[PDB]
Design a protein around this ligand. Structure first.
Ligand code: FES
Lengths: 150, 93, 128, 341
């Protein structure tokens, strides 16, 4: 991880083969392995649709249109057979879907996890590539700490 | 399809032998559908909130996406603290 | 005659709430299991049935006995007691692997039998 | 020179006593990006230099490394484009070829006295034949040939020492060792380190030439009972000794687990006293002008590992009359009461 100080060398290189787990002397069965946890009563509702759509909404960067086309793409190729047999229409439409998705994925948000590691200093919200076309900010030289606070 | 086979030891056998195959075109079509599914997933899940490579855990410390960023970081931050230590000794500890 | 003075505090306290000391006389040092069995005191506990223990060799950790005031006349831990029990308070020895010495021996070893299934801790004075 | 490697060896102690040499190098030339190709347990010491750059881990005293690792480090020293090497690995041929394979303008190394240095002069700029084959047995200096070559009189004075062993601690190691001894029963001002415990561990920072350097615990119990308590914090090299120390000197005594020499120096800088035996703790105490006493197994090793005891006026060196580290445990207490307050 970080290890700002140098870590302590382990005087016990446990073994080339055996795992790094604790022994059975110190193993509290049931609670560690989950063999006697999960007392029903602390559980929650959301029966299989209030937790699927919750998980879809948990991990999604899709807007109204991009996303709707994602939901209707694979049903379109699934009905490319068993309803008709177009042929090259399927591939042309799939390429069109890919290209329009990539054009849409030039998102107005830039989400600073996209940028280089050297950018993470502080105050990176004042950096706005989101609106400023032709940024013209020579900070990607990465050999000296310029003050970009203006 | 139906065949009766006599065997001395145990019993008779009523083999059926439905010789079939997916066919040359349907194999191409399942290749097609799986490649299209790969396209759909590569785009959609590529446009998903990748929770690990977004936070200050990965992107904070280093987080370039390499495999040497850990080792070059823990080889540089010793150098950065040594340089800051020389700067501290430059101004009387 | 050379008599070693055992005590053999039982693990279960009496209904009074006080421990019971039995003071077995058995002579000499051969093996604490054979002493506690020849002199008929509870060593094993629920493992006292025939095949429920290894019966002297040391392959089970069943005849373990907490021994205090016993740094005087014992054999050291024979690396079976040091291995078959590994994380114990170090006053606990296996009776059939330990040995209280030779025939010409006198001493006041007090050996709390059945340290498992006990309520007391014995508060041994810190060594050195 | 502009970039300078260092292929040193020995562990914690021998990597520590090389800090005068590296400060000498950085004093000789204006700007030297110094690098160290040392063993593990040696890189940790290179938190305390403020004069080094990389400090990689090689263990050059392996003699039989993985060819992948060997070629990796050869190409690394090549691609860093050094101008000096200054091994003090104490080997001639074989290792001389390892220094020659590095594109270095001035290959400098130590040399075995035996026949093992059959052809080291064919590859090295300097020879530096040595003594005892166990150079840490030579004592504290260990580098007088390397020093009296480095910055020889060509234009100016050598100035081979610069207030010897100016180690330096960072603020993060200071904070974490402060939290360590505050989790112990110690206060930042009034406490005393120990760093002598019978163990079987390389974290005690002993030496490569000293075997009877670490003192027992019952004798240490008698030593520490002879002295009134200025809260002596115990510096164990491994946690297995903790339950041993509490079994010997008592549960009330506070023990601090330090294996990193940087953390050890951060403990020294906050301590107001040192009762170390012949470990790196003595030299880390002589650094930053801290009061030590410095037990030893003989006056010979005491003079060899502490020659400058008459210059700090606090490290009242102690030894044993006979060998095997069986000291008096009486007068050491007296001058400990003298110097610690
Ligand atoms: S009876 Fe099996 S250990 Fe003593």
């Amino acid at each position: 991880g970080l290890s700002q100080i140098e870590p302590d060398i382990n005087e016990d290189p446990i073994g080339q083969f055996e795992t790094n787990s604790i022994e059975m002397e110190d193993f509290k069965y049931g609670y560690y392995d989950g063999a006697h946890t999960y007392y029903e009563g602390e559980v929650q509702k959301g029966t299989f649709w209030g937790a699927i759509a919750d998980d879809i909404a948990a991990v999604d960067q899709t807007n109204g249109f991009q996303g709707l086309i994602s939901c209707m793409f694979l049903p379109a190729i699934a009905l490319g057979m068993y309803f008709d047999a177009p042929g090259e229409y399927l591939f042309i439409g799939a390429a069109l879907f890919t290209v329009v998705f990539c054009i849409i994925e030039m998102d107005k948000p830039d989400q600073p996890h996209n940028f280089e590691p050297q950018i993470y200093k502080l105050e990176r919200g004042a950096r706005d590539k989101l609106i400023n076309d032709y940024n013209t900010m020579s900070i990607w030289d990465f050999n000296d700490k310029y003050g970009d606070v203006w | 399809a139906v065949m009766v086979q006599q065997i001395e030891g145990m019993r008779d056998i009523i083999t059926e032998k439905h010789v079939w195959h997916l066919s040359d075109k349907a194999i191409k079509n399942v290749y097609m559908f799986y490649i299209m599914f790969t396209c759909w997933g590569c785009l959609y899940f590529g446009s998903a909130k990748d929770p690990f490579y977004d936070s200050e855990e990965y992107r904070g410390d280093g987080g370039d996406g390499t495999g040497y960023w850990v080792y070059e970081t823990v080889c540089i931050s010793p150098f950065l603290i040594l340089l800051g230590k020389k700067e501290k000794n430059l101004e009387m500890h | 005659p050379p008599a070693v003075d055992f005590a053999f505090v039982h693990s279960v306290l009496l209904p009074d709430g006080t421990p019971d000391v039995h003071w077995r006389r058995a002579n000499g040092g051969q093996k604490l299991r054979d002493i506690m069995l020849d002199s008929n005191i509870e060593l094993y506990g629920p493992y006292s049935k025939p095949l429920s223990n290894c019966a002297g060799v040391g392959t089970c950790a069943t005849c373990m006995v907490e021994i205090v005031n016993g740094k005087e006349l014992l054999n050291p831990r024979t690396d079976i007691e040091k291995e078959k029990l590994k994380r114990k308070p170090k006053n606990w020895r296996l009776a059939c692997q330990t040995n209280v010495g030779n025939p010409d021996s006198t001493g006041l070893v007090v050996i709390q039998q059945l340290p498992e299934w006990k309520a007391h801790e014995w508060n041994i004075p810190k060594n050195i | 020179v502009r970039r300078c490697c260092c292929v040193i060896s020995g562990g914690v102690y021998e990597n520590l006593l090389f800090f005068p040499t590296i400060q000498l190098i950085k004093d000789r030339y204006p700007g030297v990006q110094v690098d160290i190709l040392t063993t593990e347990r040696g890189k940790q010491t290179y938190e305390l230099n403020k004069n080094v750059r990389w400090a990689n881990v090689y263990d050059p005293d392996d003699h039989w490394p993985e060819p992948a690792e060997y070629t990796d480090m050869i190409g690394l020293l090549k691609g860093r484009y050094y101008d000096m090497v200054l091994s003090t690995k104490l080997a001639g041929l074989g290792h001389a070829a390892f220094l020659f394979m590095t594109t270095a303008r001035d290959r400098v190394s130590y040399i075995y006295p035996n026949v093992n240095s059959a052809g080291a002069g064919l590859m090295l700029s300097e020879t530096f034949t040595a003594e005892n084959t166990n150079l840490s047995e030579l004592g504290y200096s260990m580098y007088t040939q390397m020093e009296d070559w480095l910055g020889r009189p060509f234009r100016s004075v050598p100035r081979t020492p610069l207030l010897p062993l100016r180690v330096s601690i960072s603020r993060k190691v200071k904070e974490v060792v402060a939290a360590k001894y505050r989790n112990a029963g110690a206060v930042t001002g009034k406490f005393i380190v120990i760093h002598g415990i019978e163990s079987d561990s390389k974290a005690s920072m002993q030496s490569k030439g000293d075997a009877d350097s670490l003192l027992s615990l019952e004798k240490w119990a008698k030593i520490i009972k002879g002295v009134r308590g200025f809260k002596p914090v115990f510096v164990i090299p491994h946690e297995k000794e903790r339950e041993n120390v509490e079994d010997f000197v008592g549960d009330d005594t506070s023990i601090v687990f330090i294996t990193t020499p940087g953390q050890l120096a951060a403990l020294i800088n906050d301590s107001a006293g040192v009762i170390a035996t012949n470990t790196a703790a003595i030299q880390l105490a002589n650094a930053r002008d801290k009061p030590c006493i410095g037990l030893f197994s003989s006056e010979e090793k005491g003079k060899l590992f502490v020659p400058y005891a008459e210059e700090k006026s606090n490290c009242v060196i102690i030894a044993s009359k006979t060998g095997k580290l069986a000291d008096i445990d009486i007068g050491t207490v007296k001058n400990a009461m003298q110097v610690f307050e």
